[PDB]
């Protein structure tokens, strides 16, 4: 099985799972620890922001690849803003501070 780009889920902006659903590989927790074990800071940054979740990042990246410019414009993951709204939907005021 292989996936470059196709459909994703509803709640989250990450790719679907499986083969019958044309989906990508779950880059799990211990693989993130293995990339932290190297100096792979940029590989991990595209591994969890551009390739997976951030919608503006992935559309800009697809257009940047097909122009011939391997460069990522990262932004913030969508599932973290989903986390902010689920935590904030309690009586909890979680924010994002100064520039």
């Amino acid at each position: 099985h292989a996936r470059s780009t196709g459909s994703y889920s509803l709640v989250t902006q990450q790719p679907l799972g499986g083969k019958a659903q044309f989906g990508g590989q779950r880059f799990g927790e211990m693989e993130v620890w293995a990339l932290e074990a190297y100096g792979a800071a940029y590989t991990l940054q595209e591994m969890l922001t551009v390739k997976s979740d951030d919608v503006n990042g992935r559309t800009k990246m697809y257009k940047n690849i097909v122009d011939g410019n391997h460069q990522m414009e990262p932004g913030m993951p969508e599932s973290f803003n989903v986390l902010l709204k689920e935590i904030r939907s309690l009586g909890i005021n979680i924010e994002l501070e100064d520039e």
Partner: protein, 1335 residues
């Protein structure tokens, strides 16, 4: 873009500021059409239009007026994702307190209003009343009231009196709670009391009272008044395949809260009576509490069928919340997965990758390449071209592959060598071809395994895959110094068959002018691959400074050793191939090649090793047959001699001469002896079976048996497995844990019958159950370790210290187990090591000890090295580059940046699978004696007896290093003395552990002081001997009239005056303990070394109990202060022990549980770190008593003992840094001139920078005290709540952070993996240097 994440409470004004419209109706959707509800949960005006830039109902179907809201639609006009960020709010009719601040253990409202949880819930569920500023009545403010208590009060205090209930009353209490006022009171209460329990109970209440005043969190924000609703997009309502909507659980929760709130508003309209609106508000309280955190209240609500439905807190917490399932691990585009296979033609920087996966993973690069050439125009055309797969896109694909690495990943990645980057080579096929040597890194066999491929998209990621994660760059395991590209199984058989010899072959003893014609004689058919031969080889030894000097000579060698010499690079000597080359020898061949010639010859030489091993293993034809497993001819007579022996033992058992346990022990002993004899018979019969003549009489050699080369080469097989295929397969054990007395005398070449196979299945089912349940604890151990580490990044170059732990070789009592060169390899010395002669600067004080320095250490026989350890590093927030050590997979020091906490945590937890889950001293060598911790005396006979319990007996050799060590008890008969030379095997120690010696220092006469027969001691004349002994009783058997009497022996002179201790003016009286029996009676003159009484008496969960720092059930008790010791009160729960120091203050004591067999007498002076009883010892006692270096030596020795018992090589840096992360918190003792509190627990770097910026001023600092937290308590007690929330319980940590108003200055690895940016360790450490500089 943004610094720290701030968490605080949500005010009702803040919740109305989040909101965009009140969600009234609970009606979800229409359900018969497609439209929602106006205005229900899924509204239009409150949130937004379903369709993008459209009024859902009807107006604006173009792009001109985005925003207009007509009365016929009551709809906003924006994007489809606008509803995902917009949230609604439910105006709760009746106030409802939060469940996270009422049941968090400890509750936030429980230790703030000074009221028990039980009483808080009673009033909260409309079952109890609470007073609130009554007035001039006889009632308190916190005191509650019941129906009867209120009824009577109602008729009594009908006027000025307030007694409400529920959240409303609670809210008022919190609202009317002067925070500041309580502070002073609490502070004054803590300074006006001495109660230990109260002190801790008051310090925990004042800590959460002053923390609330420090932030902008109000006391009335605990109760929920304006409940917030999560965005619809985040609670999606999609239908499955069919005609119904599979609705989420949160829609059930919100719809019930809104149904109940509408009912409660209608009842407060209608003025229903009291009990109706109490049940109505109570059902609303339980509905809100079920929405927020379901199931924390009594049994959780359920929709379909009996399974409870999932609430908001269950969208956060757990293995499947947002942290562990969508933020730490994500699903990933440009990724693939398939079954692996070998492909041995590869070079070790490249892997095979199928054409179909390659054309799917590289669709955008192919699109960009196709658009560059000009073959097509629009993007559609290119997608049709690769959907059709024409003849021109495969050249495009070979031009996008070429220099573009991919990340191969095996699915259980345990350490960092399980993600490696290759270059693709395209494969006709559907299976990833993976280079074989690399398999030993992935733990990948080829029995059905699968791997995932990931594509580095951007340019920095291609460079990170080539420069950090390439497979040529990972040739040493980061856990140690051992190479991980060791040749595994076929190739060592090909080498072991190639470089060997036989006593006659084709071309025996002919002479050859080079290795080239050695291979030419092997190929043409004129010699054999193993035929001993003088060749002329030219080995290049590089003895100058970087210059290779040729020396050519004639080596008496074989043909195969010359053929393998054609592949060895220049610098290695010929003697690396002159031996037989098993697996350990080829591993040290690649290791010496890496240490001498560097990286590139070692990569190309690893490939040439693998190619020549595969080729000559193919030419070998090394099969396995049924005749290869040679049965010993002596096996049947050994079994019959064992059968005669068990017959003799059972004939004694019929006549009852021997006991049953001694029978079972004798049967297990003779079957162990017969098993060892059968193994030696088959091992001789395999290791030297070949006996071939050469030009005359016969001559023997090691065998070319196939199973023996598969065992001796170390390819696959050991002694035990080849033992079970030929000799008997031992004594298998039943699942009771005890062994079975009748062994399995049949191997596998003979047939096992039925019972023997069933006993075998006992033994093997236990092993499969152990692995399949062991793997969960191994993985959870790696998780706890990488979440306690998680932060620690090499961030300096020198901390500027002179402290470091004292690396000695470790010695258990056998031969010296782990040499000093294994422990001080590549670790930077603390002070400069003196040469063992006299005062020489052998090595300087900041040199890395690589192999050349360690060889000059081994030549001089250096005792022990004071070396720098990670736990002694002075760097605030990180570890400096010298106190870590060598890079371990790079030859140099650790770079500024490389995350060492994560590689250390992986290197400790990765061998978690291989670990298991469930008289006197006899010297061995011949050397010199030395004693430490010794205070001794010469007895009458001459044997130096010892008056100290804790004496260490070292055996030092003639060179200076310490070769043996032992522990000698109090009062043992030493055959030798101090500084003496002995012989190998001579007994040097003797004692009796069943009889605790009460030996003396001086001589004289014996008097019975406080020894009265009848109450103190008893008369027990011996039965079978007649020589009686006055038996000393204990303090429990005698009655209360004489229980105060302490029996003792004090030595006098010939007159009767007390003979004093030499050095003091005190007599030497020995107080006899309980259960003693007097050996030497009254009037008998004594000497030293003679007793005065007879006193009769682990694998992987050990690694968990060392890092998590549990206490053992019966710890060894110690002394918190030095000085004289005494006893106390007679058995009220415990038996007291009072320690009065010589110069220090007296009042320390401890109540010992009296079930322990003590070690100390009444006239004994103790010390800190000195034992009082025996058994295991808790690490907190080591930390608060001996020192920090003592507890780090304790953990690294007690866990390298597990990792060495199971045989795993791990360097000690990893355990020292997880020990650093254990003892990172501290507690204050004297607050000093700072802003801390008395017994406040604060982290160590904070208090050290505080009193280091105050001590640089005039003010003297604060004196701390370090504390050792276990790894899950230490990773949950962090100054970064996302780090402590991605890990275990999120409810406790988020309420603690919310009511404290905590802020997360990100500054670690997992905060930046959550929030989606660069890691502040690796390549991103320059980015975080830049961002930290530009503030």
């Amino acid at each position: 873009e943004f610094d720290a994440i701030k968490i605080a409470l949500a005010s009702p004004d803040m919740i109305r500021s989040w909101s965009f419209g009140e969600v009234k109706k609970p009606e979800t959707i229409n359900y018969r059409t497609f439209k929602p509800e106006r205005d229900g949960l899924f509204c239009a005006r409150i949130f937004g239009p379903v369709k993008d830039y459209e009024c859902l109902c009807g107006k604006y179907k173009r792009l001109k007026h985005r925003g207009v809201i007509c009365e016929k639609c009551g709809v906003e006009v924006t994007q489809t994702k606008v509803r995902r960020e917009r949230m609604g709010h439910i105006e709760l009719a009746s106030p409802t307190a939060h469940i996270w601040f009422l049941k968090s253990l400890p509750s936030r409202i429980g230790l703030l209003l000074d009221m028990p949880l039980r009483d808080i819930e009673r009033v909260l569920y409309f079952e109890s009343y609470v007073v609130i500023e009554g007035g001039m009545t006889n009632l308190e403010r916190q005191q509650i009231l019941t129906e009867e208590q209120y009824l009577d009060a109602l008729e009594e205090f009908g006027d000025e009196f307030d007694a409400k209930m529920g959240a409303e009353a609670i809210q008022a209490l919190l609202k009317s709670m002067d925070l500041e006022q309580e502070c002073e009171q609490l502070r004054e209460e803590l300074n006006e009391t001495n109660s230990e329990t109260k002190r801790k109970k008051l310090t925990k209440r004042i800590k959460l009272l002053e923390a609330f005043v420090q932030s902008g969190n109000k006391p009335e924000w605990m109760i929920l008044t304006v409940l917030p609703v999560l965005p619809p997009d985040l609670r999606p309502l999609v239908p499955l395949d069919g005609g119904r909507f599979a609705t989420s659980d949160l829609n059930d929760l919100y719809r019930r809260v809104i149904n109940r709130n509408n009912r409660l508003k209608r009842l407060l309209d209608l003025a229903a009576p009291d009990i109706i609106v109490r049940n109505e508000k109570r059902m609303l309280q339980e509905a809100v509490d079920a929405l927020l955190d379901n199931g924390r209240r009594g049994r959780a609500i359920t929709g379909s069928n009996k399974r409870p439905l999932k609430s908001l807190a269950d969208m956060i917490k757990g293995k499947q919340g947002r942290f562990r399932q969508n933020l730490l691990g994500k699903r990933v585009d440009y990724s693939g997965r398939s079954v692996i296979t070998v492909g041995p033609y590869l070079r070790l920087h490249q892997c095979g990758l199928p054409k179909k996966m390659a054309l799917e993973l590289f669709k955008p690069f192919i699109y960009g390449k196709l658009e560059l050439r000009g073959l097509a125009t629009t993007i559609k055309a290119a997608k049709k071209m690769v959907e059709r797969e024409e003849a021109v896109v495969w050249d495009i694909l070979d031009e996008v592959i070429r220099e573009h690495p991919v990340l191969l990943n095996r699915a259980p990645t345990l350490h960092r060598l399980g993600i490696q980057a290759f270059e693709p080579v395209l494969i006709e096929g559907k299976a990833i071809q993976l280079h074989p040597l690399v398999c030993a890194a992935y733990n990948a066999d080829f029995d059905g395994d699968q791997m995932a491929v990931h594509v580095p998209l951007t340019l920095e990621a291609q460079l990170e895959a080539r420069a950090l994660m390439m497979s040529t760059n990972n040739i040493l395991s980061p856990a140690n110094g051992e190479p991980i590209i060791v040749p595994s199984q076929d190739v060592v058989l090909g080498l072991y068959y190639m470089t060997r010899d036989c006593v006659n072959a084709k071309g025996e003893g002919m002479v050859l002018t080079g290795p080239k014609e050695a291979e030419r004689l092997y190929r043409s058919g004129l010699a054999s691959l193993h035929a001993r031969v003088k060749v002329r080889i030219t080995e290049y030894e590089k003895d100058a400074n970087g210059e290779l000097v040729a020396k050519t000579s004639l080596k008496d060698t074989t043909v195969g050793r010359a053929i393998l010499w054609m592949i060895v690079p220049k610098g290695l000597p010929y003697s690396i191939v002159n031996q037989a080359l098993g697996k350990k020898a080829i591993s040290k061949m690649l290791n010496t090649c890496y240490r001498i010639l560097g990286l590139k010859p070692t990569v190309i030489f690893a490939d040439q090793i693998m190619y020549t091993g595969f080729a000559y293993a193919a030419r070998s034809g090394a099969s396995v047959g049924i005749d290869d497993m040679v049965i010993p001819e002596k096996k049947h007579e050994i079994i019959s001699e064992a059968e005669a022996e068990v017959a003799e033992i059972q004939e004694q058992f019929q006549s009852g001469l021997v006991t049953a346990g001694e029978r079972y022990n004798k049967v297990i002993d003779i079957w162990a002896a017969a098993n060892d004899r059968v193994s030696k018979a088959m091992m001789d019969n395999l290791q030297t079976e070949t006996v071939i003549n050469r030009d005359g009489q016969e001559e023997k050699q090691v065998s070319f048996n196939s199973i023996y080369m598969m065992a001796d080469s170390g390819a696959r097989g050991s002694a035990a497995q080849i033992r079970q295929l030929a000799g008997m397969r031992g004594l298998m054990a039943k699942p009771d844990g005890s062994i079975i007395e009748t062994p399995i005398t049949a191997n596998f070449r003979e047939g096992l019958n039925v019972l023997q196979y069933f006993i075998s299945t006992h033994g093997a089912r236990k092993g499969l159950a152990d692995t399949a349940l062991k793997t969960a604890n191994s993985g959870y151990l790696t998780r706890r370790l990488v979440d306690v580490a998680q932060d620690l990044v090499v961030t300096e170059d020198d901390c500027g210290t002179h402290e470091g732990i004292m690396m000695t070789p470790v010695i258990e009592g056998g031969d010296v187990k782990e040499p000093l060169r294994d422990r001080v390899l590549g670790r930077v010395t603390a002070e400069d090591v003196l040469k063992p002669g006299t005062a020489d600067i052998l090595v300087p004080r900041n040199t890395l000890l690589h192999e050349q320095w360690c060889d000059l250490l081994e030549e001089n026989s250096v005792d022990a090295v004071k070396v720098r350890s990670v736990v002694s590093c002075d760097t605030d927030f990180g570890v400096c580059a010298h106190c870590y050590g060598r890079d371990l997979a790079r030859g140099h020091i650790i770079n500024k940046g490389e995350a060492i906490g994560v590689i250390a945590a992986q290197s400790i937890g990765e061998p978690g699978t291989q670990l298991t889950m469930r008289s006197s001293i006899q010297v061995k060598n011949k050397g010199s004696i030395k004693l430490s911790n010794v205070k001794s005396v010469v007895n009458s006979s001459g044997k130096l007896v010892i008056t100290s319990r804790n004496t260490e007996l070292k055996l030092i050799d003639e060179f200076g290093r310490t070769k043996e060590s032992y522990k000698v008890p109090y009062g043992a008969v030493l055959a030798k003395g101090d500084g003496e030379q002995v012989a190998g095997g001579e007994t040097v120690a003797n004692w009796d552990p069943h009889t605790m010696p009460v030996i003396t220092e001086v001589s004289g006469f014996v008097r019975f002081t406080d020894m009265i027969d009848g109450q103190t001691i008893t008369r027990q004349t011996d039965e079978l001997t007649g020589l009686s002994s006055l038996v000393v009783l204990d303090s429990a058997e005698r009655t209360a009239g004489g229980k105060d009497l302490r029996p003792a022996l004090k030595i006098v002179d010939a007159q009767g005056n007390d003979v004093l201790i030499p050095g003091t003016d005190m007599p030497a009286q020995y107080f006899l303990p309980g259960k003693a029996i007097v050996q030497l009676e009254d009037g008998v003159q004594i000497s030293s070394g003679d007793t005065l009484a007879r006193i009769p008496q682990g694998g992987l969960p050990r690694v968990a109990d060392l890092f998590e720092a549990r206490r053992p059930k019966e710890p060894a008790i110690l002394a918190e202060i030095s000085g004289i010791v005494s006893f106390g009160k007679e058995t009220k729960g415990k038996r007291r022990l009072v320690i009065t120091p010589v110069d220090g203050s007296d009042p320390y004591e401890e109540m010992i549980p009296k079930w322990r067999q003590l070690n100390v007498f009444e006239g004994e002076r103790v010390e800190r770190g000195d034992v009082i009883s025996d058994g295991p010892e808790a690490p907190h006692d080591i930390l608060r008593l001996r020192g920090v270096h003592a507890v780090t030596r304790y953990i690294v020795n007690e866990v390298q003992d597990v990792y060495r018992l199971q045989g795993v090589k791990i360097n000690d840096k990893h355990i020292e840094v997880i020990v650093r992360q254990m003892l990172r918190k501290a507690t204050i003792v004297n607050a000093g001139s700072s802003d801390f509190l008395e017994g406040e627990q604060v982290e160590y770097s904070r208090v050290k920078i505080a009193n280091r910026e105050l001590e640089a001023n005039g003010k003297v600092g604060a004196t701390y005290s370090r504390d050792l937290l276990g790894i899950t308590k230490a990773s949950l007690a962090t100054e970064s709540f996302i780090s402590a929330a991605s890990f275990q319980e999120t409810t406790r940590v988020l309420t603690e952070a919310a009511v404290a108003g905590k802020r997360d200055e990100l500054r670690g690895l997992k905060e930046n993996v959550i929030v989606g940016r660069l890691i502040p360790a690796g390549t991103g450490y320059a980015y975080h240097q830049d961002r930290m500089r530009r503030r």
